[PDB]
Amino acid sequence: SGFRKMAFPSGKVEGCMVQVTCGTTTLNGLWLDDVVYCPRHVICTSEDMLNPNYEDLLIRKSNHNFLVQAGNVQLRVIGHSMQNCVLKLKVDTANPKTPKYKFVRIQPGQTFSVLACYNGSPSGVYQCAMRPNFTIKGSFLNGSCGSVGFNIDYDCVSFCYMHHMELPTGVHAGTDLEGNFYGPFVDRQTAQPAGTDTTITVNVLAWLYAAVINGDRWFLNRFTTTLNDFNLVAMKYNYEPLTQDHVDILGPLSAQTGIAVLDMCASLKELLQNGMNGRTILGSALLEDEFTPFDVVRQCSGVTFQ
Amino acid sequence: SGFRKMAFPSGKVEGCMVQVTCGTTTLNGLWLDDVVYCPRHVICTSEDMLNPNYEDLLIRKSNHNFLVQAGNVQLRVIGHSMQNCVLKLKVDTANPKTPKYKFVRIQPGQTFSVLACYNGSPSGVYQCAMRPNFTIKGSFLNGSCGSVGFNIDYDCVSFCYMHHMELPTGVHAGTDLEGNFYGPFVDRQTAQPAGTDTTITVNVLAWLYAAVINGDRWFLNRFTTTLNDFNLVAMKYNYEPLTQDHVDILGPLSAQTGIAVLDMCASLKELLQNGMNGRTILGSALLEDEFTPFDVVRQCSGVTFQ
Ligand SMILES: *C(=N)[C@H](C[C@@H]1CCNC1=O)NC(=O)[C@@H]1[C@@H]2[C@H](CN1C(=O)[C@@H](NC(=O)C(F)(F)F)C(C)(C)C)C2(C)C
Ligand SMILES: *C(=N)[C@H](C[C@@H]1CCNC1=O)NC(=O)[C@@H]1[C@@H]2[C@H](CN1C(=O)[C@@H](NC(=O)C(F)(F)F)C(C)(C)C)C2(C)C
C-alpha cells in the first residue's frame, strides 16, 4: 500500500546524457547511437537569444566548433544538421549504453519523468504532466536545457520531451525529440502568451481510484450520474470534458475496484460542488491531476522495467 | 525556477539489484562487489512469518538453496551469514557495476530516495523521509522487500534503508544495511506499536525558504521571535523542537534569501496559529515537511552527481 509521486528508473537515460558546448554556451545533449540531440540555442550568445536567426547562426559553425563531452571523453563531431528546434550532431562513436528507444509526441494530460541535468550530469528525477495548455510544471535552472522527459515500457525508453525555456511565472516549455514545440511557443527570449490551464479530469478520476485502492473511501457517495450531466457541472470548475475514450481507459481501475466510472464521476461532482470540508484524500487537501490511469496501475500493481 | 519532489538519479542503484529466491519465497537483493544483501525473511514460508526463528531456519539452509539471479544469469552462492535482520550471500562473481558506496544510518527527519523493485527489476523511484517515529510513508507491494533507500554525494551512494514490512495503516518499516531496524519493530507478522508521529520543523522551514526562492512570499510577516517562544507555540501543534543545530543547518538558505531563521520562525508561528486562509504555498494547501535544507539547496542550486 501507499501512493507516492513516482518516477521511472532513470538509469537508461543517465547513460545517454552528454555535455554540449558551442562557444561559451553549454547545455545538455542526448547521445543515442552515433547522434547527439540538443536544443539549437546552444549556438547563441546571450544577445542572440533575444531575437535569433538560427539558420544564419548555424551557417557560420562547423563540426569542430561543437565540443561534446561524455564524462571526460570528448566525442568527435563529424556532421551536424538542424531539425526544427533541435540540433543533431553526428559523432564518430556510437553510445554503447544506448537503450532500446523511440521518439514519441505525447498528448496533453499524459505524464512523463524528467531527468534534470547540468553540464551533462544528472541532478535528479521527477514526474511531470503535459498540461492542457502545453506547458509543464517542472524544476529547471540555468544550464538545464537538453534535459529530457521520458516514459519506459519494459526495455524501451520513449523520449517525449526536451527542455528549452521557462516563462517568468515558473512554468516550462520545450519540444519533442524532432524539435517541434509543445504549444504555441518559440525559442526566443520574448514574452509569449500561453492558454489558460485546465484540470485533467480523467487523471483526477484515476487518483480517486488510487485513493479507494488505498482505503481512503470517505468521498464515495451513493449516487450515479450521466456523462452529459457530469461534463456540464465540471465545465464550471475548469475541468476538461470527460470523453468516452477516457471512460474506456478508466475501465481497468473501475473493474478492479468495482466502482463504475459514472459512479466515481458522481462522487467527483460532489467534491467539486461541496469541497472537501477540511479533509484529505491520499494526504492531499487538493484534488490531484498529474497521475494518469496507467500511472495508478503501474504503481499499485508493481509493473517493472527491463 | 519551480520546486518538485525530486529523487536522486537511480542508475547506480539499478545496476546493483538482483532477485533472491529461497524455496518459494522471492524478494530483492543488493549486489555490491561479491556480496548480496537481502532481508532475512526470504528463508521463511508464509507460516514461518507469523513467529519465525530465523537462526533455526537458516541452520537448515546451505549455499545452493539460494537462487540469486542478475538478469537471466544465476550467481553462484559460495557462502552465507546473517547480520541482524539481513542475510549476506557471498557469490563467486563481483558486480562490475558496483558504485562507490557507504552504509549509513540516517537520523529521523532525513530524506532519501527509494528504488522500488520486484523480482530484482526496478519499478520506480520516489523520495521519502525517515519519520520521527521511525516509519516511512512509502509505496510498496508484495515482493518489494529488499528494495533500498539511498542518497548520493557526487559519485558515492550512501545506502540507508532496506525495506521489510508494512503496518496495515499503509506506513512502512525497515532496516539499515547492517540489518538493524529503524524504530522498535521486529520482522514478524504480528501487531506492533509505533510512536505517534510529529512534524519535522526544520524541514518545514527549509520548504518555506524554497517558497521564497520561488517567489511565493505572501506568508512573510514583519515580526521576529525567540527560539524559546517559537518552540513553546510549535509544541502545541505537534511540531518537533527546533534546536540550535537546526538553526545552523538553515544558515545557507537564510544567507541566500536574507531572511533570518528566527524571522522565518515568526512567519511559521503565524501560519500554525492562523492557518493558511485558503491559500497555497508552492501549490500545496498543507505545510510540507519532507524536504531537508540540503534537498532545497541541491534542487534550487542544481547540484549534480557523477
Ligand atoms: C536552458 N538551459 C534554459 C532553461 C531556463 C533557464 C531558467 N529556467 C529555465 O528553465 N533556457 C533559457 O534560458 C531560454 C533560452 C533563451 C531564453 N530562455 C528562457 O527560458 C527565458 N524565458 C523566456 O524567454 C520566455 F519567457 F519566453 F519563456 C528566461 C527569461 C531566461 C527564463 C531561449 C533561447 C528561449
Ligand atoms: C516484502 N516483500 C513485504 C512487503 C510488504 C508487503 C505489502 N506491503 C509491504 O510493504 N513484507 C512482508 O510481507 C512482511 C514480512 C512478514 C509479514 N510482512 C508485512 O509487511 C505484514 N505487516 C506486519 O506484519 C506488520 F503489521 F507487523 F508490519 C503484512 C500484514 C503482510 C503487510 C514479515 C516477515 C514481517
PDB file of C-alpha atoms in Angstrom, chain A residues 48-253:
ATOM      1  CA  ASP A  48      21.491  36.305 -29.934  1.00  0.00           C
ATOM      2  CA  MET A  49      18.753  34.797 -27.772  1.00  0.00           C
ATOM      3  CA  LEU A  50      16.652  37.996 -27.765  1.00  0.00           C
ATOM      4  CA  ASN A  51      15.946  37.579 -31.499  1.00  0.00           C
ATOM      5  CA  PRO A  52      17.881  34.682 -33.027  1.00  0.00           C
ATOM      6  CA  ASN A  53      18.192  33.692 -36.659  1.00  0.00           C
ATOM      7  CA  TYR A  54      19.232  30.097 -36.038  1.00  0.00           C
ATOM      8  CA  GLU A  55      19.801  29.272 -39.702  1.00  0.00           C
ATOM      9  CA  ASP A  56      22.190  32.204 -40.051  1.00  0.00           C
ATOM     10  CA  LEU A  57      23.979  31.339 -36.798  1.00  0.00           C
ATOM     11  CA  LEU A  58      24.425  27.671 -37.814  1.00  0.00           C
ATOM     12  CA  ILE A  59      25.835  28.601 -41.273  1.00  0.00           C
ATOM     13  CA  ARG A  60      28.878  30.036 -39.520  1.00  0.00           C
ATOM     14  CA  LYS A  61      29.539  26.936 -37.411  1.00  0.00           C
ATOM     15  CA  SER A  62      31.459  23.861 -38.488  1.00  0.00           C
ATOM     16  CA  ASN A  63      31.655  20.433 -36.867  1.00  0.00           C
ATOM     17  CA  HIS A  64      34.736  21.145 -34.767  1.00  0.00           C
ATOM     18  CA  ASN A  65      33.027  24.146 -33.106  1.00  0.00           C
ATOM     19  CA  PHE A  66      30.859  21.711 -31.104  1.00  0.00           C
ATOM     20  CA  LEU A  67      32.598  20.344 -28.020  1.00  0.00           C
ATOM     21  CA  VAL A  68      30.735  17.205 -26.942  1.00  0.00           C
ATOM     22  CA  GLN A  69      31.862  15.594 -23.706  1.00  0.00           C
ATOM     23  CA  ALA A  70      30.743  12.223 -22.347  1.00  0.00           C
ATOM     24  CA  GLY A  71      32.324  12.239 -18.932  1.00  0.00           C
ATOM     25  CA  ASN A  72      35.928  13.293 -19.529  1.00  0.00           C
ATOM     26  CA  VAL A  73      35.984  11.884 -23.085  1.00  0.00           C
ATOM     27  CA  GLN A  74      35.495  14.305 -25.967  1.00  0.00           C
ATOM     28  CA  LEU A  75      33.319  12.894 -28.757  1.00  0.00           C
ATOM     29  CA  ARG A  76      34.492  13.974 -32.198  1.00  0.00           C
ATOM     30  CA  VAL A  77      31.744  15.665 -34.222  1.00  0.00           C
ATOM     31  CA  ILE A  78      31.682  14.610 -37.890  1.00  0.00           C
ATOM     32  CA  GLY A  79      28.403  16.132 -39.087  1.00  0.00           C
ATOM     33  CA  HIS A  80      25.587  18.395 -37.995  1.00  0.00           C
ATOM     34  CA  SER A  81      22.088  19.427 -39.007  1.00  0.00           C
ATOM     35  CA  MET A  82      19.088  21.279 -37.601  1.00  0.00           C
ATOM     36  CA  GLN A  83      15.631  19.711 -37.321  1.00  0.00           C
ATOM     37  CA  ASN A  84      13.088  22.288 -36.175  1.00  0.00           C
ATOM     38  CA  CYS A  85      14.349  23.466 -32.755  1.00  0.00           C
ATOM     39  CA  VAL A  86      16.882  20.689 -32.147  1.00  0.00           C
ATOM     40  CA  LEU A  87      20.401  20.212 -33.425  1.00  0.00           C
ATOM     41  CA  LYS A  88      21.645  16.777 -34.399  1.00  0.00           C
ATOM     42  CA  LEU A  89      25.401  16.263 -34.058  1.00  0.00           C
ATOM     43  CA  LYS A  90      26.771  13.144 -35.725  1.00  0.00           C
ATOM     44  CA  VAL A  91      29.731  11.797 -33.737  1.00  0.00           C
ATOM     45  CA  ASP A  92      32.303   9.179 -34.724  1.00  0.00           C
ATOM     46  CA  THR A  93      31.456   6.918 -31.761  1.00  0.00           C
ATOM     47  CA  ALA A  94      28.193   5.112 -31.080  1.00  0.00           C
ATOM     48  CA  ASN A  95      26.974   5.214 -27.499  1.00  0.00           C
ATOM     49  CA  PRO A  96      27.432   1.641 -26.199  1.00  0.00           C
ATOM     50  CA  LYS A  97      24.828   2.367 -23.498  1.00  0.00           C
ATOM     51  CA  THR A  98      22.072   3.270 -25.991  1.00  0.00           C
ATOM     52  CA  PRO A  99      18.832   1.638 -24.810  1.00  0.00           C
ATOM     53  CA  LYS A 100      16.029   0.445 -26.986  1.00  0.00           C
ATOM     54  CA  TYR A 101      14.205   3.702 -27.652  1.00  0.00           C
ATOM     55  CA  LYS A 102      11.521   5.600 -29.550  1.00  0.00           C
ATOM     56  CA  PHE A 103      10.686   9.262 -30.092  1.00  0.00           C
ATOM     57  CA  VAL A 104       7.044   9.982 -29.292  1.00  0.00           C
ATOM     58  CA  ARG A 105       4.870  13.072 -29.149  1.00  0.00           C
ATOM     59  CA  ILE A 106       2.625  12.915 -26.114  1.00  0.00           C
ATOM     60  CA  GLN A 107      -0.885  14.231 -25.627  1.00  0.00           C
ATOM     61  CA  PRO A 108      -1.968  16.883 -23.129  1.00  0.00           C
ATOM     62  CA  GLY A 109      -2.733  15.151 -19.846  1.00  0.00           C
ATOM     63  CA  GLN A 110      -0.069  12.467 -20.238  1.00  0.00           C
ATOM     64  CA  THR A 111       2.758  12.236 -17.740  1.00  0.00           C
ATOM     65  CA  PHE A 112       6.468  11.579 -18.007  1.00  0.00           C
ATOM     66  CA  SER A 113       9.638  11.508 -15.935  1.00  0.00           C
ATOM     67  CA  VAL A 114      12.220  14.285 -16.251  1.00  0.00           C
ATOM     68  CA  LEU A 115      15.912  13.662 -15.640  1.00  0.00           C
ATOM     69  CA  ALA A 116      17.125  17.150 -14.796  1.00  0.00           C
ATOM     70  CA  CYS A 117      20.772  17.581 -15.810  1.00  0.00           C
ATOM     71  CA  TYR A 118      23.541  20.213 -15.703  1.00  0.00           C
ATOM     72  CA  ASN A 119      26.810  20.053 -17.646  1.00  0.00           C
ATOM     73  CA  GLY A 120      25.839  16.603 -18.901  1.00  0.00           C
ATOM     74  CA  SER A 121      25.434  15.189 -15.372  1.00  0.00           C
ATOM     75  CA  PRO A 122      22.164  14.171 -13.689  1.00  0.00           C
ATOM     76  CA  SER A 123      20.828  16.176 -10.751  1.00  0.00           C
ATOM     77  CA  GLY A 124      17.536  14.425 -10.043  1.00  0.00           C
ATOM     78  CA  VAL A 125      14.386  12.859 -11.405  1.00  0.00           C
ATOM     79  CA  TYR A 126      10.778  13.927 -11.019  1.00  0.00           C
ATOM     80  CA  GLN A 127       7.380  13.285 -12.568  1.00  0.00           C
ATOM     81  CA  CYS A 128       5.517  15.897 -14.679  1.00  0.00           C
ATOM     82  CA  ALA A 129       2.356  16.144 -16.771  1.00  0.00           C
ATOM     83  CA  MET A 130       1.944  17.818 -20.139  1.00  0.00           C
ATOM     84  CA  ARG A 131      -0.613  20.433 -19.119  1.00  0.00           C
ATOM     85  CA  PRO A 132      -3.645  21.108 -21.323  1.00  0.00           C
ATOM     86  CA  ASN A 133      -2.034  24.456 -22.259  1.00  0.00           C
ATOM     87  CA  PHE A 134       1.140  22.581 -23.342  1.00  0.00           C
ATOM     88  CA  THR A 135       3.314  23.821 -20.506  1.00  0.00           C
ATOM     89  CA  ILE A 136       4.807  21.623 -17.800  1.00  0.00           C
ATOM     90  CA  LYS A 137       5.351  22.450 -14.132  1.00  0.00           C
ATOM     91  CA  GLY A 138       8.981  21.437 -13.820  1.00  0.00           C
ATOM     92  CA  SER A 139      12.029  22.427 -11.811  1.00  0.00           C
ATOM     93  CA  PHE A 140      14.780  23.789 -14.042  1.00  0.00           C
ATOM     94  CA  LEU A 141      17.709  26.183 -13.649  1.00  0.00           C
ATOM     95  CA  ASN A 142      20.230  27.826 -15.938  1.00  0.00           C
ATOM     96  CA  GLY A 143      22.018  25.105 -17.884  1.00  0.00           C
ATOM     97  CA  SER A 144      19.176  22.546 -17.670  1.00  0.00           C
ATOM     98  CA  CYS A 145      18.225  22.770 -21.335  1.00  0.00           C
ATOM     99  CA  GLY A 146      18.553  19.475 -23.165  1.00  0.00           C
ATOM    100  CA  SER A 147      17.304  17.598 -20.120  1.00  0.00           C
ATOM    101  CA  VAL A 148      14.716  15.114 -21.384  1.00  0.00           C
ATOM    102  CA  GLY A 149      11.362  13.673 -20.398  1.00  0.00           C
ATOM    103  CA  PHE A 150      10.536  10.031 -20.990  1.00  0.00           C
ATOM    104  CA  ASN A 151       8.397   7.003 -20.260  1.00  0.00           C
ATOM    105  CA  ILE A 152       9.550   3.401 -20.153  1.00  0.00           C
ATOM    106  CA  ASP A 153       7.800   0.286 -21.460  1.00  0.00           C
ATOM    107  CA  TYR A 154       9.661  -2.852 -20.335  1.00  0.00           C
ATOM    108  CA  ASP A 155      13.039  -2.217 -22.004  1.00  0.00           C
ATOM    109  CA  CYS A 156      12.043   0.611 -24.392  1.00  0.00           C
ATOM    110  CA  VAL A 157      12.582   4.265 -23.487  1.00  0.00           C
ATOM    111  CA  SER A 158      10.050   6.554 -25.176  1.00  0.00           C
ATOM    112  CA  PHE A 159      11.540  10.038 -25.210  1.00  0.00           C
ATOM    113  CA  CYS A 160       8.826  12.676 -25.365  1.00  0.00           C
ATOM    114  CA  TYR A 161      10.264  15.988 -24.176  1.00  0.00           C
ATOM    115  CA  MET A 162      13.422  18.097 -24.382  1.00  0.00           C
ATOM    116  CA  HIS A 163      13.608  21.179 -22.176  1.00  0.00           C
ATOM    117  CA  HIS A 164      14.083  24.654 -23.731  1.00  0.00           C
ATOM    118  CA  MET A 165      12.670  27.530 -21.685  1.00  0.00           C
ATOM    119  CA  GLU A 166      10.876  28.976 -18.655  1.00  0.00           C
ATOM    120  CA  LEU A 167       8.125  31.511 -18.560  1.00  0.00           C
ATOM    121  CA  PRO A 168       8.775  34.049 -15.730  1.00  0.00           C
ATOM    122  CA  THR A 169       5.834  32.508 -13.843  1.00  0.00           C
ATOM    123  CA  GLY A 170       7.853  29.333 -13.174  1.00  0.00           C
ATOM    124  CA  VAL A 171       6.261  27.119 -15.839  1.00  0.00           C
ATOM    125  CA  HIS A 172       8.229  25.396 -18.538  1.00  0.00           C
ATOM    126  CA  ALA A 173       8.151  24.728 -22.269  1.00  0.00           C
ATOM    127  CA  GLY A 174      10.004  22.514 -24.700  1.00  0.00           C
ATOM    128  CA  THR A 175       9.899  20.249 -27.719  1.00  0.00           C
ATOM    129  CA  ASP A 176       9.535  16.666 -28.747  1.00  0.00           C
ATOM    130  CA  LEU A 177      12.726  14.961 -29.931  1.00  0.00           C
ATOM    131  CA  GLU A 178      12.005  16.058 -33.504  1.00  0.00           C
ATOM    132  CA  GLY A 179      12.373  19.648 -32.263  1.00  0.00           C
ATOM    133  CA  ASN A 180       8.702  20.658 -32.543  1.00  0.00           C
ATOM    134  CA  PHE A 181       7.468  22.709 -29.592  1.00  0.00           C
ATOM    135  CA  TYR A 182       4.582  21.610 -27.496  1.00  0.00           C
ATOM    136  CA  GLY A 183       2.267  24.611 -27.615  1.00  0.00           C
ATOM    137  CA  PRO A 184       2.347  27.952 -29.429  1.00  0.00           C
ATOM    138  CA  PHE A 185       5.847  28.846 -28.293  1.00  0.00           C
ATOM    139  CA  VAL A 186       9.127  29.744 -29.968  1.00  0.00           C
ATOM    140  CA  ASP A 187      12.702  29.548 -28.671  1.00  0.00           C
ATOM    141  CA  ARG A 188      13.281  33.289 -28.410  1.00  0.00           C
ATOM    142  CA  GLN A 189      13.669  35.428 -25.290  1.00  0.00           C
ATOM    143  CA  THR A 190      10.479  37.438 -25.657  1.00  0.00           C
ATOM    144  CA  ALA A 191       7.104  37.474 -23.906  1.00  0.00           C
ATOM    145  CA  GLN A 192       4.654  34.871 -25.254  1.00  0.00           C
ATOM    146  CA  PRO A 193       1.026  34.032 -24.434  1.00  0.00           C
ATOM    147  CA  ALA A 194       0.033  30.639 -23.019  1.00  0.00           C
ATOM    148  CA  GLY A 195      -3.541  29.423 -22.869  1.00  0.00           C
ATOM    149  CA  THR A 196      -5.252  29.275 -19.520  1.00  0.00           C
ATOM    150  CA  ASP A 197      -4.695  25.898 -17.968  1.00  0.00           C
ATOM    151  CA  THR A 198      -7.410  23.383 -17.088  1.00  0.00           C
ATOM    152  CA  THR A 199      -7.712  20.399 -14.745  1.00  0.00           C
ATOM    153  CA  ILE A 200      -7.138  16.951 -16.278  1.00  0.00           C
ATOM    154  CA  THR A 201     -10.410  15.246 -15.318  1.00  0.00           C
ATOM    155  CA  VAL A 202      -9.532  11.675 -16.308  1.00  0.00           C
ATOM    156  CA  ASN A 203      -6.406  11.902 -14.129  1.00  0.00           C
ATOM    157  CA  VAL A 204      -8.357  13.172 -11.110  1.00  0.00           C
ATOM    158  CA  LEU A 205     -10.650  10.168 -11.508  1.00  0.00           C
ATOM    159  CA  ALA A 206      -7.620   7.852 -11.721  1.00  0.00           C
ATOM    160  CA  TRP A 207      -6.280   9.301  -8.474  1.00  0.00           C
ATOM    161  CA  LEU A 208      -9.655   8.850  -6.749  1.00  0.00           C
ATOM    162  CA  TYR A 209      -9.428   5.165  -7.738  1.00  0.00           C
ATOM    163  CA  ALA A 210      -5.911   5.087  -6.280  1.00  0.00           C
ATOM    164  CA  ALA A 211      -7.399   6.515  -3.088  1.00  0.00           C
ATOM    165  CA  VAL A 212     -10.052   3.759  -2.896  1.00  0.00           C
ATOM    166  CA  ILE A 213      -7.411   1.078  -3.553  1.00  0.00           C
ATOM    167  CA  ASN A 214      -5.516   2.508  -0.558  1.00  0.00           C
ATOM    168  CA  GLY A 215      -8.569   2.526   1.716  1.00  0.00           C
ATOM    169  CA  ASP A 216      -9.354   6.255   1.502  1.00  0.00           C
ATOM    170  CA  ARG A 217     -13.082   5.908   0.721  1.00  0.00           C
ATOM    171  CA  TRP A 218     -14.900   8.699   2.604  1.00  0.00           C
ATOM    172  CA  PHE A 219     -15.833  10.649  -0.537  1.00  0.00           C
ATOM    173  CA  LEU A 220     -17.751   7.804  -2.207  1.00  0.00           C
ATOM    174  CA  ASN A 221     -21.412   8.782  -2.367  1.00  0.00           C
ATOM    175  CA  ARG A 222     -24.471   6.680  -3.150  1.00  0.00           C
ATOM    176  CA  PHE A 223     -25.273   8.338  -6.487  1.00  0.00           C
ATOM    177  CA  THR A 224     -24.603   7.898 -10.172  1.00  0.00           C
ATOM    178  CA  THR A 225     -24.672  10.491 -12.958  1.00  0.00           C
ATOM    179  CA  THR A 226     -24.738  10.717 -16.725  1.00  0.00           C
ATOM    180  CA  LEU A 227     -21.629  11.642 -18.682  1.00  0.00           C
ATOM    181  CA  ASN A 228     -23.523  14.664 -20.031  1.00  0.00           C
ATOM    182  CA  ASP A 229     -24.580  15.870 -16.584  1.00  0.00           C
ATOM    183  CA  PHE A 230     -21.075  15.397 -15.220  1.00  0.00           C
ATOM    184  CA  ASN A 231     -19.497  17.413 -18.026  1.00  0.00           C
ATOM    185  CA  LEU A 232     -21.917  20.328 -17.560  1.00  0.00           C
ATOM    186  CA  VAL A 233     -21.108  20.548 -13.845  1.00  0.00           C
ATOM    187  CA  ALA A 234     -17.351  20.076 -14.331  1.00  0.00           C
ATOM    188  CA  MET A 235     -17.077  22.752 -17.047  1.00  0.00           C
ATOM    189  CA  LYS A 236     -17.916  25.404 -14.436  1.00  0.00           C
ATOM    190  CA  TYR A 237     -14.880  24.331 -12.392  1.00  0.00           C
ATOM    191  CA  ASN A 238     -12.443  24.493 -15.325  1.00  0.00           C
ATOM    192  CA  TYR A 239     -12.230  20.713 -15.688  1.00  0.00           C
ATOM    193  CA  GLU A 240     -11.627  19.299 -19.149  1.00  0.00           C
ATOM    194  CA  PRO A 241     -14.518  17.348 -20.704  1.00  0.00           C
ATOM    195  CA  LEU A 242     -14.530  13.626 -19.976  1.00  0.00           C
ATOM    196  CA  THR A 243     -14.856  11.610 -23.176  1.00  0.00           C
ATOM    197  CA  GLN A 244     -15.928   8.037 -23.827  1.00  0.00           C
ATOM    198  CA  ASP A 245     -12.276   7.299 -24.644  1.00  0.00           C
ATOM    199  CA  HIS A 246     -11.431   8.473 -21.122  1.00  0.00           C
ATOM    200  CA  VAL A 247     -14.179   6.290 -19.663  1.00  0.00           C
ATOM    201  CA  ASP A 248     -12.759   3.319 -21.579  1.00  0.00           C
ATOM    202  CA  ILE A 249      -9.200   3.979 -20.342  1.00  0.00           C
ATOM    203  CA  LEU A 250     -10.530   4.033 -16.759  1.00  0.00           C
ATOM    204  CA  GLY A 251     -12.041   0.571 -17.274  1.00  0.00           C
ATOM    205  CA  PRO A 252      -9.235  -1.436 -15.629  1.00  0.00           C
ATOM    206  CA  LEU A 253      -9.409   0.650 -12.432  1.00  0.00           C
TER     207      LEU A 253
END
